Structure 1
Amino acid sequence: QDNSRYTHFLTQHYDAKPQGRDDRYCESIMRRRGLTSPCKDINTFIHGNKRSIKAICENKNGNPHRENLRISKSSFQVTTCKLHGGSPWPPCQYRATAGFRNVVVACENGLPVHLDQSIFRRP
């Protein structure tokens, strides 16, 4: 809330660079950040520059996309960890599907406060 809304989104999403781009990394980070209780079905850990993340809401390094969504021009490394556990409750087996592509971070107030997992629905 109020500047920390963005980096609540970046607690969950922004993990500046992983251990590796694999399922042991994504089970580890989902455990430690704790979207593991209950298991989040799909969540992308974004990796890159934090300066780049904020600058997606700038018009220089991110285009406006309809109604306040901001599609990036500086594609980020994005490990889209999808749950292939089966259990909704912990433990959660996360299979990492690593890709590198542009995020649609939804921006309020000059801060990307959110990010659609609409792109990252089926990685």
Structure 2
Amino acid sequence: QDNSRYTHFLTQHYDAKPQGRDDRYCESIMRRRGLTSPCQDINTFIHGNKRSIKAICENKNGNPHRENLRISKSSFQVTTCKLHGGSPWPPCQYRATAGFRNVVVACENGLPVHLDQSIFRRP
């Protein structure tokens, strides 16, 4: 209930220095982060350092966006893992897509607590 939404944000969407950002990378980090009981169908990780991600909450590196979101001014190395196979039960098979662009998050008390996945559900 307190700042735990932010640490959960880090757990779900942050990875400081991934290695290869290939399929195997996805399948492994998605398991290690526990987004595998029902297999999450899409999930994106942001790379780089925490300070600049947090700064998306201030005008320093963010802009108000849509209803209540914030869009970053800078771009981030990012990797999106998409479930492949339909069945939502393990084994969870992921296809990885590395990318570089700004992100949309929701802030709370000056901290990111939500990553908007729609801009990566790139069709």
- Provide the residue aligned with 2:53 in structure 1: 53
Q: Tell me the alpha carbon deviations over residues 4-63 of structure 1, each in whole angstroms, 9 at most, x when there is no partner.
A: 211101101101121211001110001111111111010001111100110000101111
Q: Tell me the alpha carbon deviations over residues 55-93 of structure 1, each in whole angstroms, 9 at most, x when there is no partner.
A: 000101111113331100121111011111332101111
Gaps of 5+ in 1: none
Distance 1:85 1:19, change over 3 A: farther
- Between the two proteins, the alignment pairs up a number of residues equal to 123
**Structure 2 residue matching 1:35: 3-state secondary structure:** coil
Instruction: Map 1:94-109 to 2 at 5 A.
Output: 94-109=94-109
- The share of aligned pairs that are identical, in percent, is 99
Q: Normalising to structure 1: TM-score of the pair?
A: 0.94
**Structure 2 residue matching 1:118: 3-state secondary structure:** helix
Task: For 2:121 and 2:2, locate their aligned partners in 1 and report how far apart those are by CA, in whole Å.
Answer: 28
Conserved? CA contact 1:68–1:108, under 8 Å: no
Task: For 2:120 and 2:29, locate their aligned partners in 1 and report how far apart those are by CA, in whole Å.
Answer: 18
Q: 4+ residue runs of structure 1 moved beyond 3 angstroms?
A: none
Conserved? CA contact 1:78–1:99, under 8 Å: yes
Task: For 2:112 and 2:106, locate their aligned partners in 1 and report how far apart those are by CA, in whole Å.
Answer: 5
Conserved? CA contact 1:81–1:97, under 8 Å: yes
Q: Normalising to structure 2: TM-score of the pair?
A: 0.94
Please report the RMSD computed on the Cα atoms of aligned residues, expressed in angstroms.
Answer: 1.2
Gaps of 5+ in 2: none
